[PDB]
Design a protein that fits this description.
binds iron/sulfur cluster; 0% strand; DNA primase large subunit; mainly alpha
Length: 183
């Protein structure tokens, strides 16, 4: 818990290592104080995969869902706590909930209005992606190359380009490779 915990996953230091899909999910969670089902699973299983413990996960999700008065803790406990405990096996289930790889993420239903799951290299417009990539300090030539991969359907190559330019396809591998470059 020294490094990955409910508080540190909101730090710029740790979150600088998140790939775009995780950044998007964290932003939707921060703004809306909620995530719909597919995004709850994609993010909660990614965070489990980077080492967020069961106790710290329940801190993280209960604090994020009840933030700014969005819902009471009683409502969180009645309507969401079981779901997060289930993802960690804490009610005894033996379903294998491993973090989703990129192919799994891409194969989930595409996000509609109000959804933050998926892969931004596919799901975002080029203008949204360009603005996001500019905020990550990429230049026009870099953005054009990333968008070229996106237009070709090569989303994991686009993501790999972003990793290289800012420093099996899997968000947790992106995180681990990026975090190792801070150590
Ligand atoms: S390529 Fe994979 S890790 Fe990168 S943003 Fe898309 S789903 Fe996430």
């Amino acid at each position: 818990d020294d490094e990955i915990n409910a508080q540190s996953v909101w730090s710029e230091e740790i979150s600088s290592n998140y790939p775009l899909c995780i950044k998007n999910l964290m932003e939707g969670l921060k703004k809306n104080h909620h995530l719909r089902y597919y995004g709850r699973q994609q993010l909660s299983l990614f965070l489990k995969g980077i080492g967020l413990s069961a106790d710290e996960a329940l801190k993280f999700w209960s604090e994020a869902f009840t933030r700014n008065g969005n819902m009471t803790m009683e409502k969180f406990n009645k309507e969401y706590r079981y779901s997060f405990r289930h993802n960690y096996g804490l009610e005894g289930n033996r379903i294998n909930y491993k973090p989703w790889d990129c192919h799994t993420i891409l194969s989930k239903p595409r996000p509609g209005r109000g959804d933050y799951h998926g892969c931004p290299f596919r799901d975002w417009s080029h203008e949204r992606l360009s603005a996001e990539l500019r905020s990550m300090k990429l230049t026009q030539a870099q953005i054009i190359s990333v968008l070229d991969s996106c237009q070709k359907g090569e989303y994991t190559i686009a993501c790999t380009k972003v990793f290289e330019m800012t420093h099996i396809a899997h968000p947790n591998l992106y995180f681990e490779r990026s975090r190792q470059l801070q150590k």
